[model samples]
Target: PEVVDWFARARRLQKQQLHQLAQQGTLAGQISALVHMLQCERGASNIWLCSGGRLYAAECRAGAALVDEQLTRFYAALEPARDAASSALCWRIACAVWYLPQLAALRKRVRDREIAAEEATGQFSRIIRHLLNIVPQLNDSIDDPQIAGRMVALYSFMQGKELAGQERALGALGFARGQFSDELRQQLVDRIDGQQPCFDSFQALAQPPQTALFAEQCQASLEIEQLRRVACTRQPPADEGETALRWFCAQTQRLEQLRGVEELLIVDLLNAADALLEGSIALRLDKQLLPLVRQQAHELQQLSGQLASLKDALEERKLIEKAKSVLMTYQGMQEEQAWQALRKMAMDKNQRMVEIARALLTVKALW
Candidate 1:
């Protein structure tokens, strides 16, 4: 009862602080306070867990409304905390909030048959790619066989379904089975058999693989996929055109779904925290909470590896920008001309744009 009372009071206090910080209309104070609280409140780490999700949702919604600026702000936020393990918490909070809500909405769409399996799986792949980017703080290419297997299975499953005209076979001998044409079925069976070491290695419990937890995981993956699509679109469907209007309305519904999912993420984290604090999950917080978060941290890194390519792109963009500026100043070249020159040099030398940029910078220095 004492611990229970402590948890309740701590939760309330954390929320009160968060609410007040949020009033400042920025996340730095709120995020900073939460990070500090995690260090101080040993009994209330769950507050941090739940708080991360809530703050993430609010911040995400705000960012989504201001997409371009939010991406800039997001990258800036990452730059300072690049080496700080604690800073990873802030990224997770924002990411969980951003993607989790989208996951929940996408789940509903899948359940309601509003989207096809292929579309849903594609969306899931994208979300997983983004999650991979944000999670791993260290080596960007970290691989977790379990997560990788699940991702591969999802895409493969979709492919098989499509080849079989989207037919689903009933469970046979308790195995979740799929219906496919002779060639398609043979191909899927062979693929699964070949990848069995990687994919079918989950032996945790004597239960079906399609447990609520697994289903939810898949849902999260798909929802992330949907979010990427939403973010990538250059323009919304026209309001006046009937077909376009229909598309606009559907997307609007998806946004509403996102709102619902945000609430779900907050509530789910809070409940999971309560369960943990009640000693139902573990007798020692260190044994339970710390280990769980650590696993997630590892998974995050594994997922974040997806961003390795993006890092290279970002670096190249900076290099090119700087070199272009130098060339413009040194030779009085226009922006387009400078870019063309860099591209021509890159092609002739069989080098990348950034390599050409570096060479130009050297020439400018010599001149």
Candidate 2:
């Protein structure tokens, strides 16, 4: 009975960590909400400035209201946590908090077109970046690597999402201005190219169907590519405002889709925590279970590695399919032809199909 009591005590300790994890989820949700609203505000301000105050005026005010509201909620969530976590956690929070106050002046700066779209978007991106950087810190007490890895995925995805938003703003500015200079084109390319690694890390660590849905829904489209081409190589159509509005709407749609994935990520995170929390509450271990638990733990670890390879295959297939479609579009190749081409190229170069696919994409980006 004494041994069983000790077992229950250990379970209680784990339950507390589960509570910590679930507790941390609340503020994580709050910060993510705040970041999203700020991103929307930055986009609106960029558009309004780029359009000479003709667009997103109402949206800007709406964005402001939402941002301000979310900020209040976020700070309220933080009211109890002034006495926080690890050493670097304290440092990261310090940096994040220090920048938050300036958002007022920054938003005001954006309002009167007092800032250039590039710098303004950069400011918002910095603030948002610092805010997202706080997320990985919240995982400091997370003892499970799988759980911590999920948090890392969330951070990377959100970071990439911020890059996408900045790209939207930058692209809008270029469209509204009627052309992309070499420097501006380079900036656009940087943001465009910058988003993939975050997503790659995300897919590597995250489970489906968030991963599945993203692969399915986040593919490039003709409309998106047409605007990208116009921004990169071609001149804007005669009506630059029309093109600007089109870019804004299309990119906004893209952001909103990513938002769907983000929301699901958060939901899935909380659900994971709750599932463990709920199970741990009624958890009971037998007097003979200690040895059995240790053995199963080892078994589970090996089984997880096997599953990891399976997931890797699924993800690699996604890349292969993507590259196939790119070939289909760019070369007018049939699906079978595209598949064979990638396979043949992989064999000839002594590379994996995924690597060959990635190389083709890098070439596409430069084009």
Q: Which candidate leads in TM-score? A: 2
Report the Cα lDDT for residue 135, model 1: 26
- Please give, for residues 1-367, the per-residue lDDT of candidate 1 as tens digits: 7889977875665444332211221223222222222111211111112232222233333323443344345455445444433555556545634753464565455444566433554454344334333323321221222222222232222222121111111001001111223233222222222222212222121125333333343233343233222322223233223322233234334333333432333233334333433424355545323444345444323322322246654665678888888779888999757765765566466555666788877777485
For candidate 1, the lDDT comes to 0.36
Candidate 2 wrong stretches, greater than 4 Å: 1-15, 279-367
Task: Give the Å shift of residue 122 in candidate 1.
Answer: 8.5
Estimate every model's Cα lDDT from 0 to 1. Answer: 0.36, 0.73
Pick out the ten consecutive residues of candidate 1 with the lowest summed lDDT: 165-174
lDDT of 2 by residue, 102-208 (tens): 98898787787898887877778777867776776676656544556567677767777877887788788788888887557645654665565557667866787
Q: Per-residue error at 325 for model 2, in Å?
A: 32
